Design a protein around this ligand. Structure first.
Ligand SMILES: [Mg+2]
Lengths: 40, 152, 112, 107, 226, 254, 62, 126, 215
RNA sequence: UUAGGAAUAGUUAAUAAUAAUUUAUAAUUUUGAUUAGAUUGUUUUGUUAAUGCUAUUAGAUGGGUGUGGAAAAAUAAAAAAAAUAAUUAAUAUAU
């Protein structure tokens, strides 16, 4: 399941979900680290 | 492409510093060129005056491997590997190095280990892969018995 | 199918009356299908259920389907009060994000 | 030409066809009428298509409208079955009133 | 497939990736092709807190009794412009205020120039519709020096957040055709002093020390304490 | 019976010639998107190798009955802007339709006018493009464009391409696949040949120079500050949304 | 506290301190009077924090 | 010990469904027949149902089963049952279709005897 | 009148042959025994039968079945056989000043070439998607279903699995026995008497197709 | 399969026939059909000396949507469902 942290981009919309899937570059970097540790 | 490859290798070996222009004008956009074109052209890139021209030409050759769907061979990446102290062009991905270190350290400590050098029959081989067993276990019976009305 | 024990008698087929969903929708105010003419001034009592009353249903409670012009009714909602905590942003952690915004309504009731 | 080929799997008729032999029983008048009247209706339908286009076009149009707008035009296991009242016989009483019986042949 | 992540590797369903191929996974849905997308929820929703205390008017309502004072009309136009600009700048809002509809200029998204990402679009043609904030834009895409051969449709050209720097030397009139900008490897010779590659294949950016500190504090390696 | 000859697998399908979403209209800029890269490679071929019937002295005179049968799919170049008779001249003035000749006009001969010729029966188009010489590409003396006055000289420089297509067809029809022969250009090798006087003025570099200084280091990598879409290595996005392989990720923010 | 049916923040008084929270297994959470989904959420959050993943997820209530 | 085929069938049922069979399926239930119609006024023209009729294709009494040992298995080596058959032509009223009557054997183990039944097929002759 | 489709010209060319069984010689003879044109009314009629609006396109015979192609080739063979002294004089090395005769000769050459091309289409590509026919002004309901629906995404075509299969009558066409045995006669009738029918590479292919499909 | 046994049909084959304007001395059935009744089947159950008698709960579902590869789609304690959520153990549910 794709994790939605609290510090993602919030979608201020009353017609749908309140949080998007747009990350932070720190989240991108740590996801790359976890990707390498799974790649082994 | 193999006809243009000999021309590119001749212009590299003669040291005329014009094989890259021939590769751009004739072989780059209109041929399915493989990776040994850049294995020839890296020696021509090496003979440049300044190191930054060598670096930018190697990086542009890597972008040419990305764009025209011609992946870099092992020999080209090993040619760029040997000059990493001068050019500092990274030629392996972030995934292959993390696999390589964790594999190489484990294989070195496994070869140095004296306990785990013993064979493992669960791991080393498959004992039998045929759909039928190799010797008769007695079954089937092919006859009925008491209380069995359905035969065959 | 389901495993059913065989009986030598007849089988009872019940059509038993459940709690009507339209009844709890009219009580909770979340019907959105009742066309009611003859707008009156008598007040309306609505028992607030769990996650059954929002702005969408309260707008139809103010303006019903009959073509009203003004919310001319007093609306009593039993147990509809909400309590909000103050929200704040987290400076620490992996990034910047605002938490704390939550409603204490419908779960923490008054007068235990 | 009385024995089929076991190797190639040909029939009794195809082996005699490949040998240039004719094994055909003496037909009656109706059996010759069955084999002689196949071309007559084709020449009649081709002459109708060439001679009356304003009627053949309307007939083909209403035939395509009846074919296209049908309910069971999707190729499925039910539409692909050879015998629908025999394979699906539990629908012939309470659901489908097209076929009144479930047996029409030796199967 | 054409392009799988890490080849065939199926110890987990996350090892394949969030999408199995850059092509669409079914033929009947061509909109499921993998492409770079844009956060349209934050961008397309402009701030309505600038239109408060401002009387807007409908288009059809041209009756005399619904007309407003011309000072109120002017502040309504100023508030509507501030509402349209409040999130970002569109392509059609930047090209209207440029000469020759901005043909030949370089448009770019905000995140197209940060990190090791380098990509812009040299504008070639724009068809404005009657609502001039929308339309269809075309251009040559330039990514790390390499350039397309034909003009491609600029995806998300209607979503705001675009930027350009107007250069008079790049302006192409309506009589002539916008030329493709040259590929730095192919067309013009490669010069390290003019353009230097930020990124290349088999290259990854080094780890920032603040990200290293943040990950080692989140994992518990460094002693994070209040 | 008739039902049991074959199965229903792979039935007869409606062709793309009768579907409007598969047929490219010539009043649209999408007509000039498909056919303009075919022209910029044909002029690269005709400037480097002799193409037999690519340049004539006049328009090919087929009879009026054989006009629709033989002419679509045929291309030839003539000198000057002379248009065939029994056609209605429609000049392409749309900048959305003229933008696809950008590589054709910049790196090769400058495009002056693009005209679409529609006949009286509205069944045989002609895409007329008038170029102004000279070529930016080097032209071989044995090439086909050496026999053209507008291409060799540097009114008299104008020459026109003529391509006949059918009006409402899929873009399979307006293809030029027989002209994709890749003939080489001997312009970098003409310096060192026996026909040039520069053959003794170049100096060969048999060894690389000794490098005392290493390469210039890159500037300090600054990470982005905006919200990113996610990991492009698992969203199946190519390395910039443009080209490359997803398995070899590069050129993104990290 | 993310789920509606996992009221994690309603059991602050069921623990002494940080060590009492991080030493209790699921049987001791059953002893203290915590429902099944809530104690499963508490135990998975503790096991994720021990593995290096802090509880940084979006509250999906509204 | 040599286990019978029922052990192998029970093993197959265990590996398929997780368990062999739920117990208490007999129950010794008194199945009573309650008639509704009049004495000789059953709504059928041939078979008048007045008792508990058993339902089952191969699990009824007296028990039948196919007998695979006949002339066809002695003559033809078949890839599957019913692939090759030998019969007599009885009808040629249809075009390119010969009606062929063939015989097969059905075994009664209670009386220990095989009987010859007849099946008609439509064959093709061009 | 001048037909606008190939099918109307096929019907007219069939009515010409069937309306004059033994009078097929006197119907279409417009020339003498020396090559000079006798009656120009028959010439003007036969020129406007094979009109440019009917047989001008390269795919003009795309909806012609195996039975209509026999009518086309029988009409061409009868026109060649009744006026052989005209054709063998004028088509080889003769230039004529009459503007009607050059138009008739061009129309006849175009009709014979597209008829032989359709014969090679039905022979060398049996049941191919490029050998499929359809009805003229045929109802293709997928287009009318896409037009009278609202497409928010035009790539999503409604009733695609049924609309792509169904059009007004559309068959996979291959040459039968009665078609191939007639076309092998008509293609040999299209040539001259001095030509060798052994080296014709289309009659031999039709005969070998007949033998292969009969075996 | 029916304690009191007779007729059946969107019908059979051929076919240059998708989408049958034609041809035929057509097809099923007393070796038991169609309809009506009972009705998931199944060496898994029980009993016995018993090739006998007696039981059964795997399933499927031509008009709800031509979507989808496949309608099986109006509701099932897991079959963990695209970042290692958790994988020490037992309750795993009431809560
Ligand atoms: Mg007949």
């Amino acid at each position: 399941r794709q994790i939605r942290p609290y510090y993602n981009l919030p979608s201020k919309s009353e017609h749908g979900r309140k949080m998007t899937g747009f990350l932070t570059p720190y989240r991108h970097w740590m996801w790359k680290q976890n990707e390498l540790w799974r790649n082994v | 492409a193999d006809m243009h490859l000999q021309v590119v290798e001749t212009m590299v070996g003669c040291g005329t510093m014009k094989a890259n222009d021939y590769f751009v004008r004739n072989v780059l956009r209109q041929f399915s060129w493989d990776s040994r074109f850049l294995e020839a052209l890296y020696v021509e890139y090496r003979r440049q005056d300044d190191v930054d021209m060598w670096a930018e030409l190697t990086k542009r050759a890597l972008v040419w491997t990305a764009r025209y769907n011609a992946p870099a061979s092992e020999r080209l990446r090993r040619l760029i590997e040997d000059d990493y102290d001068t050019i500092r062009v990274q030629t392996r991905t972030f995934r292959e190095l993390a696999v390589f270190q964790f594999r190489d350290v484990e294989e070195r400590r496994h070869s140095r280990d004296v306990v785990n050098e013993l064979p493992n029959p669960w791991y080393d081989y498959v004992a039998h892969a045929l759909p039928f067993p190799d010797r008769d276990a007695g079954y089937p019976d092919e006859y009925g018995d008491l209380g069995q009305w359905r035969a065959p | 199918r389901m495993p059913r024990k065989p009986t030598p008698y007849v089988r009872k087929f019940l059509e038993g009356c459940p709690l009507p969903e339209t009844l709890v929708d009219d009580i909770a105010g979340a019907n959105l299908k009742s066309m009611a003419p003859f707008f009156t001034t008598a007040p309306r009592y609505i028992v607030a259920a769990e996650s059954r009353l929002s702005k969408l249903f309260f707008h139809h409670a103010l303006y019903p389907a009959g073509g009203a012009r003004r919310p001319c009714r007093v609306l009593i909602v039993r147990g509809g009060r909400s309590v909000r905590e103050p929200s704040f942003t987290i400076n620490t952690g992996g990034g910047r994000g605002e938490v704390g915004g939550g409603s204490r309504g419908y779960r923490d009731p008054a007068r235990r | 030409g009385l024995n089929g080929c076991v190797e190639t799997g040909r029939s009794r008729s195809e082996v005699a066809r490949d040998l240039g032999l004719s094994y055909t029983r003496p037909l009656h008048e109706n059996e010759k009428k069955q084999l002689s009247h196949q071309a007559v209706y084709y020449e009649r339908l081709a002459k109708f298509k060439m001679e009356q286009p304003e009627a053949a076009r309307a007939m083909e149009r209403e035939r395509f409208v009846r074919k296209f707008s049908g309910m069971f035009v999707k190729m499925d296991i039910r539409s692909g079955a050879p015998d629908f009242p025999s394979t699906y016989r539990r629908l012939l009483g309470t659901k489908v009133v097209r076929w009144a019986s479930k047996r029409h042949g030796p199967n | 497939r054409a392009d799988p992540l890490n080849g065939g590797s199926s110890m987990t369903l996350g090892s394949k990736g969030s999408k199995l191929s850059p092509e669409p996974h079914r033929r009947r849905m061509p909109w499921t092709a993998a492409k770079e997308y844009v956060p349209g929820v934050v961008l397309n929703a402009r701030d309505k807190m600038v239109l408060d205390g401002v009387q807007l008017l409908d288009i059809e309502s041209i009756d005399r009794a619904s007309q407003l004072d011309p000072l109120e009309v002017l502040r309504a136009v100023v508030a509507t412009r501030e509402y349209n600009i409040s999130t970002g700048k569109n392509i059609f809002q930047l090209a209207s205020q440029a000469t020759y509809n901005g043909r030949g200029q370089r448009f770019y998204r905000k995140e197209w120039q940060e990190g090791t990402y380098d990509k812009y679009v040299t504008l070639s043609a724009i068809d404005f519709d009657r609502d001039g904030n929308k339309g269809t834009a075309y251009g040559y895409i330039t990514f790390h020096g390499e350039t397309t051969t034909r003009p491609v449709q600029v995806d998300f050209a209607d979503v705001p957040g675009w930027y350009m720097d107007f250069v008079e030397e790049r302006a192409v009139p309506f009589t002539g055709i916008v030329p493709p900008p040259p590929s730095i490897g192919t067309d013009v010779p490669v010069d390290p002093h003019s353009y230097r590659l930020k990124a290349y294949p088999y290259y990854d950016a080094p780890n920032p020390p603040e990200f290293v500190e943040r990950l080692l504090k989140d994992r518990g390696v460094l002693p994070d304490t209040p | 019976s008739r039902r049991f000859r074959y199965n229903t697998k792979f039935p007869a399908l409606v062709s793309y010639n009768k579907l409007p979403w598969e047929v490219v209209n010539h009043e649209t800029p999408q007509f000039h998107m498909h056919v303009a890269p075919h022209y910029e490679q044909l002029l690269t071929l005709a400037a480097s190798s002799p193409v037999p019937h690519i340049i004539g002295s006049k328009h090919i005179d087929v009879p009026r009955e054989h006009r629709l049968r033989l002419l679509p799919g045929m291309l030839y170049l003539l000198d000057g802007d002379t248009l065939p008779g029994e056609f209605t001249i429609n000049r392409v003035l749309d900048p959305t339709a003229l933008q696809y000749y950008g590589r054709l006009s910049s790196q090769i001969v400058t495009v002056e006018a693009v005209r679409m010729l529609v006949p009286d029966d509205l069944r045989l188009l002609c895409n007329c493009i008038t170029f102004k010489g000279p070529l930016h590409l080097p032209v071989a003396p044995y090439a086909s464009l050496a026999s053209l006055r507008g291409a060799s000289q540097g009114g008299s420089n104008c020459f026109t391409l003529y391509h006949f297509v059918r009006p409402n067809r899929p873009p399979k029809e307006l293809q030029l696949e027989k002209y994709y022969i890749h003939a080489p250009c001997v312009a970098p090798l003409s310096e060192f040949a026996s026909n040039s006087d520069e053959r003794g003025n170049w100096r060969p570099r048999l060894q690389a120079p000794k490098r005392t200084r290493r390469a210039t280091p890159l500037p300090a990598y600054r990470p982005p500050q905006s919200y990113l879409m996610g990991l492009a290595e698992r969203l199946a996005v190519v390395p910039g949304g443009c080209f490359g392989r997803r398995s070899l990720m590069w050129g993104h923010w990290f | 506290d993310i789920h509606r049916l996992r009221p994690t923040s309603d059991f602050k008084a069921s623990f002494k301190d940080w060590n009492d929270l991080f030493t209790c297994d699921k049987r001791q959470l059953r002893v203290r009077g915590i429902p099944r989904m809530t104690r499963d959420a508490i135990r998975t959050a503790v096991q994720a924090f021990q593995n290096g993943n802090p509880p940084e997820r979006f509250d999906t209530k509204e | 010990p040599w286990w019978n085929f029922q052990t192998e069938h029970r093993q197959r049922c265990v590996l398929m469904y997780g368990g062999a069979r739920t117990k208490n399926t007999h129950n010794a239930n008194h199945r009573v027949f309650i008639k509704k119609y009049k004495r000789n006024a059953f709504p059928n023209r041939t078979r008048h149902h007045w008792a508990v009729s058993m339902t089952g294709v191969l699990s009824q009494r007296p028990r039948r089963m196919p007998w695979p040992y006949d002339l066809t298995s002695l003559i033809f080596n078949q890839p599957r049952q019913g692939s090759d058959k030998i019969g007599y032509v009885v009808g040629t009223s249809m075009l390119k279709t010969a009606v062929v009557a063939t015989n097969h054997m059905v075994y009664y183990p209670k009386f220990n005897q095989r009987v010859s039944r007849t099946k008609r097929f439509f064959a093709h002759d061009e | 009148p001048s037909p606008h489709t190939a099918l109307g010209a096929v019907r007219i060319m069939a009515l010409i042959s069937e309306g004059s069984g033994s009078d097929i010689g006197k119907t279409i003879m417009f020339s003498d025994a020396f090559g000079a044109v006798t009656r120009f009314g028959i010439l003007r009629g036969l020129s406007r039968v094979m009109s440019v609006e009917a047989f001008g396109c390269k795919d003009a015979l795309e909806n012609v079945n195996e039975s209509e192609l026999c009518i086309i080739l029988h009409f061409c063979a009868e026109v060649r056989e009744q006026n052989a002294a005209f054709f063998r004089r004028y088509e080889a090395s003769e230039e004529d000043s009459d503007p009607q005769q050059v138009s008739f000769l061009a129309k006849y050459q175009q009709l014979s070439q597209i008829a032989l091309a359709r014969c090679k289409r039905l022979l060398y590509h049996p049941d191919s998607p490029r050998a499929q026919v359809m009805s003229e002004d045929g109802y293709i309901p997928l287009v009318e279903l896409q037009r009278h629906a609202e497409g928010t995404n035009k790539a999503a075509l409604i009733h695609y699995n049924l609309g792509i299969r169904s059009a007004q009558g559309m068959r996979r066409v291959a040459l039968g026995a009665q078609s191939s045995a007639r076309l092998a006669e008509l293609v040999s009738r299209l040539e001259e008497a001095s030509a060798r029918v052994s080296g014709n590479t289309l009659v031999n292919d039709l005969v070998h197709h007949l033998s292969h499909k009969a075996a």
